[PDB]
Each structure stands twice: as C-alpha cells, then as structure tokens.
Amino acid sequence: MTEYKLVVVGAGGVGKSALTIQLIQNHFVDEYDPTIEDSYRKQVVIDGETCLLDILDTAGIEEYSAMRDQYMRTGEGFLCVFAINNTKSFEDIHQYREQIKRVKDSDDVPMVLVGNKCDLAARTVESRQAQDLARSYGIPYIETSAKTRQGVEDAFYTLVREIRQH
Ligand SMILES: Nc1nc2c(ncn2[C@@H]2O[C@H](COP(=O)(O)OP(=O)(O)NP(=O)(O)O)[C@@H](O)[C@H]2O)c(=O)[nH]1
Numbered sequence: 001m002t003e004y005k006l007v008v009v010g011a012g013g014v015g016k017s018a019l020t021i022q023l024i025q026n027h028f029v030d031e032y033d034p035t036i037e038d039s040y041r042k043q044v045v046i047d048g049e050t051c052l053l054d055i056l057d058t059a060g061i062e063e064y065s066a067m068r069d070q071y072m073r074t075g076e077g078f079l080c081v082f083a084i085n086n087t088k089s090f091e092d093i094h095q096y097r098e099q100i101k102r103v104k105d106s107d108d109v110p111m112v113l114v115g116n117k118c119d120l121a122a123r124t125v126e127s128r129q130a131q132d133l134a135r136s137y138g139i140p141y142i143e144t145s146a147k148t149r150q151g152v153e154d155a156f157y158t159l160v161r162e163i164r165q166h
C-alpha cells in the first residue's frame with residue numbers, strides 16, 4: 001500500500017530510539033545504548049489509510065554517524081528531536097535542518113520539531129521558545145515523552161500528515 005519513509009534525527013541521548021521503540025513496540029527503553037543506524041517497519045492505519053511506515057533511527061553521537069547522510073537521503077519526512085532538559089540539543093537543531101536540506105537538496109522538506117522528555121521537570125527549553133523556532137521553519141512543534149507515551153503517536157502521525165501536504 002502507501003509507504004512513508006520517516007527519519008528521526010537529533011543530538012545524542014535526546015530520545016530518538018526511545019520514541020521510535022515506544023511507537024513501534026509499545027514499551028519504554030530505560031537504558032542508553034548509542035545508535036549507529038537502525039530501521040523499523042510497521043503497517044498502521046493513519047486517518048483511514050492503511051500504510052507502511054519505514055522509520056530510520058539515526059545516530060546522534062558524531063563518532064557513530066558514519067554514512068548518516070546516505071541513509072537520510074531516502075527519507076520523505078524528518079522528525080527533528082531535541083530534549084526539553086537539554087538546551088544544547090535545541091541549539092543543535094539548526095545544524096540538523098541544514099543537513100536535511102543538503103541530503104534532500106531542497107528547502108521545502110516535510111519536518112516536525114519534537115521536544116522530547118516532557119515528563120521531566122528540569123526544563124530549560126520553554127514551549128514558547130520551541131514554538132518560535134518551529135514557526136520560523138514553517139513546521140509544527142510537538143512535545144513528547146517516550147516514557148509515558150504522551151504525544152508519541154501524534155508526533156509521527158503529524159509527520160505523515162506533513163508529508164501528505166507536500
Ligand atoms: N524521562 C525520559 N527519559 C527518556 C525519554 N526518551 C528517552 N529517554 C532516556 O534517555 C536516554 C537516551 O535515550 P535514547 O532513545 O537512547 O536516545 P538517542 O537519541 O536515541 N541516543 P543516540 O543518538 O546516541 O542513538 C535513555 O536512558 C532513555 O531512557 C523520555 O521521554 N523521558
């Protein structure tokens with residue numbers, strides 16, 4: 001059926017893998033095992049449409065980001081993730097957007113800004129600050145928690161809906 005290729009990017013430790021695993025496997029990964037390049041595939045119904053989700057979980061740690069560019073190149077939509085208790089990861093978003101622009105050779109790529117770990121209280125990135133960044137990119141801002149599942153389905157499904165507007 002219809003297939004959507006999603007790519008999750010962002011700094012190391014922000015929760016990219018936890019978000020994907022929570023979405024696909026319905027459980028929270030408590031430990032931190034750095035990712036190289038992993039992919040998941042699941043058939044789901046989104047807004048009445050039976051579709052196949054191909055999700056690429058990329059490395060956030062530089063030393064592990066070998067041919068990251070090559071893997072991202074096939075992506076149709078990207079989830080740019082930062083953690084609300086990690087200001088540096090938020091500032092790093094700019095760099096990921098530029099990378100996506102390169103790999104896709106386009107300035108109009110489907111994207112969604114995600115503020116993960118919203119279950120934690122050590123917030124240093126206020127919602128408003130992220131809303132402003134997203135607005136400048138012309139994309140949605142959504143907060144999530146791979147731990148409680150809050151906003152997880154909404155983030156991925158919203159990305160699909162952004163791809164459909166492309
Ligand atoms: N409290 C809380 N912890 C989270 C959340 N998402 C991820 N974590 C925790 O953050 C740590 C790193 O998460 P992980 O998903 O591995 O991060 P990553 O972005 O995939 N790292 P890497 O880029 O190296 O592959 C883990 O200990 C994980 O449990 C969340 O929403 N809430």
Ligand SMILES: [Ca+2]
Pocket residue numbers: 031032033
């Ligand atoms: Ca381990």
Ligand SMILES: [Mg+2]
Pocket residue numbers: 016017018033034035057058059060
């Ligand atoms: Mg990971």
Ligand SMILES: [Mg+2]
Pocket residue numbers: 124
């Ligand atoms: Mg501040």
